[PDB]
Structure formats: C-alpha cells, structure tokens
C-alpha cells in the first residue's frame, strides 16, 4: 500500500478515536471473559503428545479452574493390636469435597483419595450420629460443615470392586500426569525438576571468532 498517506490516516485515526470517546456513552464496566486457546502457534507443527490446549503464556488463574471446596474429614472404625488384644480406634481420612457434590461423590472421593490398602476394602456406608445418609442428596441438604462428624460403617462380608478410570488430578483443563501418585492437594506447588537436563547454547549466531566487528546481529 501507499505509505505516504499513512500519517494523514493517523490524523484520521486520532479524529475517529476522539469522536468515539465523546459521542457514545459507556454504560458500565463489562465483565472480563475467560480467554480461550488459539490454534495458530508459530513455528513448525507440534505433536499430539504435547498438545496441552495452551499455546500462549497466561500468568493468572481464571474462573473455570477455581473450585469451592470443603475440607471434610471422615472417620473409620479400625482395630489395633495391643498386648491384651484387639482395641477399637479411629482412622481419619481427609478429602476436599466441592460444595455442590452429593454424598455418593463424597464416598467416591474417599475411595480414590485414601491410598491405604486396609481402609476401603469392602462396601461401606456414610452416616452421621448413627443415622445413615442418602447418597442422592447434596451436602447442603444435610447442612454438613467442616465440624460435622461423619463415620463410615463397613460391611466386611462384601468385597468392594472399584474401577479407577478417573485420574486423581482431573480438572476442566484435562491436564493429568501418568505418574501422579498423589492427590493434587497434597503435592507441593513448586519443586526441583530431576527428570530434565540443563542445556546451554552451543550454536553461535553470528559471532564465531577473532574480532567482534558487528556480530551479524541482523542475521
């Protein structure tokens, strides 16, 4: 295009802007929508092994990954061996259940986050003060809070056959590890990376030798 008509267009680009701020009336601050992902990354094509649905840098955490959680601790009747014999004690399993979850989902969260081979071994039932809980009801329908004492009464004659097809760290962004081995609430945020290797620059761009005249910085 003809570049000599640019700056005059810039004057019009001033005068269209200053009219637009003066003509219309702003009603109010519009809420910020969560930005999606673009499929137009630069360079060569990536593989499906590394397609993580994020091709830019966003340093902030938006609303779809934010969950409202309750630290629900659920008790189990266990038996320990002392010098006399068996003694009945209590083993506590703590989970982070969402506020809008049902009691069957709380039971599944206890199943997938106990990581103990002696606790969730048979079909158990959640109860509060002996009264059993309906698994098709929400936690808000029973008024269950962090201080609500929930017990798990087992029926040891049965055998719990579970199918852990859902990963332990499953959020809406669909990014889960295969060697995860721990609930995401228990693992630390930042740790040292032992699997990778530190690599330095071995390919010089323009400067190779004796006298740095220009360094070929245009390249």
């Amino acid at each position: 295009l003809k570049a000599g008509l640019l700056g005059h267009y810039q004057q019009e680009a001033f005068e269209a802007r200053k009219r637009f701020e003066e003509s219309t009336t702003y009603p109010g601050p519009i809420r910020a929508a969560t930005p999606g992902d673009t499929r137009f990354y630069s360079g060569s094509l990536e593989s499906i092994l590394h397609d993580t649905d994020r091709h830019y840098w966003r340093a902030v955490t938006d609303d779809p990954r934010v969950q409202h959680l309750i630290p629900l601790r659920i008790r189990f009747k266990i038996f320990t061996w002392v010098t006399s014999g068996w003694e009945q004690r209590m083993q506590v399993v703590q989970i982070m259940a969402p506020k809008d979850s049902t009691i069957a989902q709380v039971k599944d969260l206890v199943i997938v986050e106990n990581q103990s081979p002696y606790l969730c071994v048979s079909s158990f039932h959640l109860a509060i003060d002996g009264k059993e809980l309906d698994p098709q009801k929400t936690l808000g329908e029973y008024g269950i809070t962090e201080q609500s004492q929930i017990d798990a009464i087992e029926q040891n004659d049965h055998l719990l056959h579970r199918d852990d097809e859902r990963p332990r760290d499953w959020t809406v962004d669909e990014i889960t590890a295969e060697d995860v081995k721990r609930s995401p609430y228990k693992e630390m945020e930042m740790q040292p990376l032992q699997n990778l290797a530190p690599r330095y620059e071995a390919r010089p761009k323009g400067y190779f030798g004796r006298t740095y005249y220009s360094g070929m910085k245009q390249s």
């Binding site: 930005p35 999606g36 992902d37 673009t38 137009f40 990354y41 091709h55 830019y56 966003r58």
Partner: peptide, 9 residues
C-alpha cells in the same frame, strides 16, 4: 495481541 488469538477466537 497478548494471547495471540485470532479475530475469530
């Protein structure tokens, strides 16, 4: 310009 999304996205 920040995220590099297109006009359509």
């Amino acid at each position: 310009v920040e995220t590099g999304r297109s006009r359509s996205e």
